[PDB]
Curated annotation (Swiss-Prot), chain A:
Organism: Saccharomyces cerevisiae (strain ATCC 204508 / S288c) (Baker's yeast)
Miscellaneous information on this protein: Present with 28100 molecules/cell in log phase SD medium. PubMed:12898710 reports two tandemly repeated copies of ATP3 (ATP3a and ATP3b) on the right arm of chromosome II in several laboratory strains, including S288c. This has not been confirmed by the yeast genome sequencing project.
Function per UniProt: Mitochondrial membrane ATP synthase (F(1)F(0) ATP synthase or Complex V) produces ATP from ADP in the presence of a proton gradient across the membrane which is generated by electron transport complexes of the respiratory chain. F-type ATPases consist of two structural domains, F(1) - containing the extramembraneous catalytic core, and F(0) - containing the membrane proton channel, linked together by a central stalk and a peripheral stalk. During catalysis, ATP synthesis in the catalytic domain of F(1) is coupled via a rotary mechanism of the central stalk subunits to proton translocation.
Description of how the protein assembles with itself and partners: F-type ATPases have 2 components, CF(1) - the catalytic core - and CF(0) - the membrane proton channel. CF(1) has five subunits: alpha(3), beta(3), gamma(1), delta(1), epsilon(1). CF(0) has three main subunits: a, b and c.
Protein name: ATP synthase subunit gamma, mitochondrial
Family the entry assigns: Belongs to the ATPase gamma chain family.
Protein's cellular compartments: Mitochondrion; Mitochondrion inner membrane
Swiss-Prot record, chain B:
Family: Belongs to the ATPase alpha/beta chains family.
Miscellaneous section: Present with 164000 molecules/cell in log phase SD medium.
Organism: Saccharomyces cerevisiae (strain ATCC 204508 / S288c) (Baker's yeast)
UniProt function note: Mitochondrial membrane ATP synthase (F(1)F(0) ATP synthase or Complex V) produces ATP from ADP in the presence of a proton gradient across the membrane which is generated by electron transport complexes of the respiratory chain. F-type ATPases consist of two structural domains, F(1) - containing the extramembraneous catalytic core, and F(0) - containing the membrane proton channel, linked together by a central stalk and a peripheral stalk. During catalysis, ATP synthesis in the catalytic domain of F(1) is coupled via a rotary mechanism of the central stalk subunits to proton translocation.
Record's subcellular location: Mitochondrion; Mitochondrion inner membrane
Subunit and interaction comment: F-type ATPases have 2 components, CF(1) - the catalytic core - and CF(0) - the membrane proton channel. CF(1) has five subunits: alpha(3), beta(3), gamma(1), delta(1), epsilon(1). CF(0) has three main subunits: a, b and c.
Protein name (database record): ATP synthase subunit beta, mitochondrial
Domain of life from the UniProt record: Eukaryota
UniProt gene name: ATP2
Phosphoserine modification, residue list: 101
From Swiss-Prot, chain C:
Location of this chain's protein in the cell: Mitochondrion inner membrane
Family to which the UniProt record says this protein belongs: Belongs to the ATPase alpha/beta chains family.
Protein name in the entry: ATP synthase subunit alpha, mitochondrial
Amino acids binding ATP: 69-76
Signal peptide: none
Portion of the parent chain present: 138 to 239 of 545
Organism: Saccharomyces cerevisiae (strain ATCC 204508 / S288c)
Cysteine pairings via disulfide bonds: none
More info: Present with 41500 molecules/cell in log phase SD medium.
Organism lineage: Eukaryota, Fungi, Dikarya, Ascomycota, Saccharomycotina
Role played: Mitochondrial membrane ATP synthase (F(1)F(0) ATP synthase or Complex V) produces ATP from ADP in the presence of a proton gradient across the membrane which is generated by electron transport complexes of the respiratory chain. F-type ATPases consist of two structural domains, F(1) - containing the extramembraneous catalytic core, and F(0) - containing the membrane proton channel, linked together by a central stalk and a peripheral stalk. During catalysis, ATP synthesis in the catalytic domain of F(1) is coupled via a rotary mechanism of the central stalk subunits to proton translocation.
Superkingdom of source: Eukaryota
Residue numbers of Phosphoserine PTMs: 41
Length: 56, 236, 102
């Protein structure tokens, strides 16, 4: 109604909040693995660059 | 019906339509009777009047009467007092929902909102119960995951969940059955599926012994034979 | 004492027709609540035989815990279970353990 349409919409917003919360946390977890990888990769890259730089 | 039940001593199968009209009618003449209107304008005698109708209908030693009473839920709000009062008084509720109708699933029965007094494991037999319990969980899971599929997508769900979703979509259209009286409405031959046969056929689906069948080959089928047959037809 | 095993209507007439009620008084229904001083703190267990109820929300005797919940979910079934578990304690002769359910 007013009452129910408010309530269902508010429920939607609540559920959305819950999902965005969930994602943000899961993202942090996933992010940790990602960062670890990026270090190792960048180190590997630096060796190739060592050639290219010194080579001109 | 009382005459049939009692005096003729036969069984009956009463049907009344639509009983919201019965509530509504009483509400109007209540107002005319000068009684101070009750909540949401319903008669203050609503409970007892409904009660008189329902209580009169019963299976006595004399006979047995199987009432099927239609109810119109105003604006599909069952929280409205008139459906809610009736909701208690009827033994074997069935809800026909707008959404399911809109999904193109006819019957429009809301599967997770259908409760019957006799549905107890002993009464319907353990096998029937177990099969139906699995259906209920699967569909309820599908609905809970539906929101997740909506925003996140289906790709972020568990492998088990993805298989469950696939079964649920298949089950959802496995519910569909064309009606005999909709050989006018849809012109598709009706189907009467034996109770045991339905338990068996649903069991197969749940076991996933038809996970090689596409979703539309469950739409408006009958038994197990039909699910396979419509799959073969569609395959061509 | 003798209203045990009687399904009676509100008037007091047996509607299971188990004959004239065995009763030691007729008492008014407008009778009042027990006073401040006539009460004692609740501490006597009662076990409903429902694992969740008994642990998550333990119930004692003389308690008035609500069972508020969703329409026609066989609300009465949850309640009825408590009555059934009282059979275990009831069967016994210890009158501490005899809950005479209504």
């Amino acid at each position: 109604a007013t009452l129910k349409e408010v309530e269902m919409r508010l429920k939607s917003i609540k559920n959305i909040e819950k999902i965005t919360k969930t994602m943000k946390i899961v993202a942090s977890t996933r992010l940790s693995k990602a960062e670890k990888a990026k270090i190792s990769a960048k180190k590997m890259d630096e060796a190739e660059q060592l050639f290219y730089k010194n080579a001109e | 019906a009382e005459y049939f039940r009692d005096e003729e001593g036969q069984d009956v199968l009463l049907f009344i339509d639509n009983i919201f009209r019965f509530t509504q009618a009483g509400s109007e003449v209540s107002a005319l009777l000068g009684r101070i209107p009750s909540a949401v304008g319903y008669q203050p005698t609503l409970a007892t009047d409904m009660g008189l109708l329902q209580e009169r209908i019963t299976t006595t030693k004399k006979g047995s009467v199987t009432s099927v009473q239609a109810v119109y839920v105003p604006a599909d709000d069952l929280t409205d007092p008139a459906p809610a009062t009736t909701f208690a008084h009827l033994d074997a509720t069935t809800v026909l929902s707008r959404g399911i109708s809109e999904l193109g699933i006819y019957p429009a029965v809301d599967p997770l909102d259908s409760k019957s007094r006799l549905l107890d494991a002993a009464v319907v037999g353990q096998e029937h119960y177990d099969v139906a319990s699995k259906v209920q969980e699967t569909l309820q899971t599908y609905k809970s995951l539906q929101d997740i599929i909506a925003i996140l997508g289906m790709d972020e769900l568990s492998e088990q969940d993805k298989l469950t979703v696939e079964r649920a979509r298949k089950i959802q259209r496995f519910l569909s059955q064309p009606f005999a009286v909709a050989e006018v409405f849809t012109g598709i031959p009706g189907k009467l599926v034996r109770l045991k046969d339905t338990v068996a056929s649903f069991k197969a689906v749940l076991e996933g012994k038809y996970d090689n069948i596409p979703e539309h080959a469950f739409y408006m089928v009958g038994g197990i034979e039909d699910v396979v047959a419509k799959a073969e037809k569609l395959a061509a | 004492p003798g209203l045990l095993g009687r399904v009676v209507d509100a008037l007091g007439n047996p509607i299971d027709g188990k004959g004239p009620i065995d009763a030691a008084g007729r008492s008014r229904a407008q009778v009042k609540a027990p006073g401040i001083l006539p009460r004692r703190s609740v501490h006597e267990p009662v076990q409903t035989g429902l694992k969740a109820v008994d642990a998550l929300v333990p119930i004692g005797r003389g308690q008035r815990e609500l069972i508020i919940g969703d329409r026609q979910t066989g609300k009465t079934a949850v309640a009825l279970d408590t009555i059934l578990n009282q059979k275990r304690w009831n069967n016994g002769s210890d009158e501490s353990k005899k809950l005479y359910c209504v």
